[PDB]
Design a protein around this ligand. Structure first.
Ligand SMILES: N[C@@H](Cc1c[nH]c[nH+]1)C(=O)O
Ligand SMILES: N[C@@H](Cc1c[nH]c[nH+]1)C(=O)O
Lengths: 415, 397
């Protein structure tokens, strides 16, 4: 009886690997280019980390985490839905901020029961821990822009917003509720549920009849005091100074309650591809010295789909040589020369047959073609006896003294 | 307000360890390309029955899905999941496949989260493929700089041979009243008891000629390629899918382990075939690289941009971006408190960063249209439009 992979948890197969490899190489290089350094936290953490970090009022913590209890230990555990809180957890646990702020990046799988596509998905993300900003905020937004350029993607647009501080949120909440209450007759059931608990999430509505209402809602940005406005405006100053286009979207709210001040999204118009923001309260909330922080994450799969849609999938890398052989004597030689060629820095596949028995030259040569190899290096009885290797570019097949094969191949790749 | 802790046995990997991981990952990934092996990534969880078909008994993190009720397990291992994808996606339709994987694995119980890199040669009868994958391990040690890692091999033959061996082992063990485990798990019975165990019937003497030919052919290839080895007949691995070739790489403990497992594919519902592979615990190899002092040096960025004044900070920002456009790695000074910092403090950060240069902007630099560059010679003024050529030139030495 055949088994299947958990629905919403895809395998990544050799045909897709190159595309992942391109993305990973590109972003990892960008990350180095800004001085960000890798941190890797576990796949599981204690459940309370997410409940306190992300917030009991959110769909993630309520409806969407994979949580369970450890048999032997009775520890409560959850597969990470996200990595910011875990970074905070490691920063606090390991005293990372003793000697100053830290530029951190991470990459790996995350988990979520969502309505539709991916219950296992992958993020790359950054955390700038200990920086008040708004310079740090500008930096991390810029890191995203550079990634699009480096990847070849165009038409990704930045929207920003401020959630201000707690008191300013509270004042705003009041007038928003007072406003939304005026139109309770037209609110849907999802809006009603959220009205008195997280009304900001009502502004995000997709409901057609609510659009003109939500667009005229009281804007959180109008309740920003001096410190907030200065931060938000200073972020905008830096972005302008670097010619980064953007729109202010006051309905931009994220599905994690740790955010304050800056929030931002990168969005494609045929949706969100990168998202982040500042979250100064979080470190204290998880028991740490009060500390400012901002960061972002990207859903890789969603960026990969974009690269496919826009035809930016690079060509499969092939190996340099495919070693073809018949005979016991030839196979030993094929092994030995395969190894020498690799010692030289070449990529080499040595023919091995599904069924164990030697194989026909024609079948091996078909495999050689399919492999993307540039040369077939061929050993039969004559070659073994004469001390040669027969090389065929994938021109005409050529005999070469085996002791010269390396120079021969190197030379020929000069082309 | 209470601090939260990392799950015991699940270590964080922090920046100061990352380079060591990066070195290992880069080295092995390059070796894997060099043999034509291609990445497959399976999920962290699978349906529990996959692993059922000590490890399975005590050692898996299993649980029940709250939404759908389905039974799920954090993978303890990756071979079965590779087989699961190969079957699910019809990977062997057009021929055999050379696969590698890397990622975290989980064991309920020094590491409860640990990491493996491994290979599966799916669809190859061998023993050529067996030789290849063993040889891949040897190359990795050389490339990593590790010495004194030794290969032991063994055959588990086929089921009937395994069974026949059991008989004579029990018959032999029965002759030495010197008892609970004799009838139950006699392999686990192999002090003054050494001379007895050392003369126990060896599984290798019950290999029929299909088995012997495979094992002997593996030995042939290994000898021809100058891979030394010892036959260790006490070598058994901790899962019953292994058939024929089994092998371990050991440091005088096991650092790589693998073998052939032809029955497994059919057992998971696939067209009958052959397969062999291996896996390595990364953490164990990393400890070795530390012990033998093969930890490479941390690499630093090329430039640290230092500034004071509002005008200077904007410029610092813009130039940091231009320098990165040109291929340099750059850290832009940003302060905890958001405002400026002292030249001395910034310069301390510049030093600690491993940057090769501090590029400095104050009000004079902004006005004059210059950048002040200090190697980490003396501090030198340069037209900002030339900073790139300046820095590149300076690094060529
Ligand atoms: N962790 C957030 C993004 C983020 C990173 N840093 C701050 N916010 C998410 O999963 O969307
Ligand atoms: N999966 C095995 C090793 C292996 C890979 N392929 C075959 N065996 C392990 O975890 O030890």
């Amino acid at each position: 009886e055949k088994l299947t992979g958990v629905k919403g948890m895809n395998d990544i197969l050799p045909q897709d690997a190159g595309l992942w490899e391109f993305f990973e190489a590109t972003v990892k290089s960008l990350l180095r280019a800004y001085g960000y350094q890798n941190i890797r936290t576990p796949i599981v953490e204690h459940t309370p980390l997410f409940t306190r970090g992300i917030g009991e009022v959110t769909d993630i913590v309520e409806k969407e985490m994979y949580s369970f209890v450890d048999a032997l230990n009775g520890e409560n555990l959850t597969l990470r839905p996200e990595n910011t809180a875990a970074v905070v957890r490691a920063a606090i646990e390991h005293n990372m901020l003793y000697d100053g702020p830290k530029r951190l990046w991470y990459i790996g799988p995350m988990f979520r029961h969502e309505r539709p596509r991916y219950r296992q998905f992958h993020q790359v993300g950054v955390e700038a821990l200990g920086f008040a900003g708004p310079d740090a905020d500008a930096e991390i937004v810029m890191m995203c822009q550079r990634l699009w350029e480096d990847l070849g993607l165009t038409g990704i647009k930045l929207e920003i917003n401020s959630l201000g501080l707690a008191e300013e949120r509270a004042a705003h909440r009041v007038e928003l509720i007072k406003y939304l209450e005026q139109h309770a007759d037209k609110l849907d059931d999802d809006a009603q549920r959220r009205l008195y608990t997280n009304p900001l999430r009502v502004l995000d509505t997709k409901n057609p009849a609510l659009q003109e209402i939500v667009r005229n809602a009281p804007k959180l940005i109008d309740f920003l005091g001096d410190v907030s406005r200065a931060h938000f405006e200073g972020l905008q100053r830096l972005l302008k100074a670097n010619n980064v286009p953007f729109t202010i979207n006051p309905r931009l709210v994220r599905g994690l309650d740790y955010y304050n001040l800056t929030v931002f999204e990168w969005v494609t118009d045929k949706g969100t591809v990168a998202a982040g923001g500042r979250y100064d309260p979080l470190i204290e909330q998880l028991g740490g010295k009060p500390t400012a922080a901002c960061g972002w994450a990207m859903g890789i799969e969603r960026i990969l789909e974009l690269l496919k849609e826009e035809h930016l999938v690079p060509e499969q890398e092939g190996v340099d040589v495919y070693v073809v052989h018949q005979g016991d004597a030839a196979r030993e030689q094929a092994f030995i020369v395969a190894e020498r060629l690799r010692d030289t820095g070449l990529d080499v596949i040595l023919h091995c047959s599904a069924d164990g028995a030697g194989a026909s030259f024609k079948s091996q040569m078909k495999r050689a073609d399919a492999s993307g190899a540039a040369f077939a290096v061929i050993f039969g009885e004559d070659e073994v006896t004469n001390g040669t290797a027969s090389v065929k570019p994938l021109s005409v097949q050529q005999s070469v003294p085996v002791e010269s094969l390396t120079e021969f191949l190197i030379n020929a790749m000069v082309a």
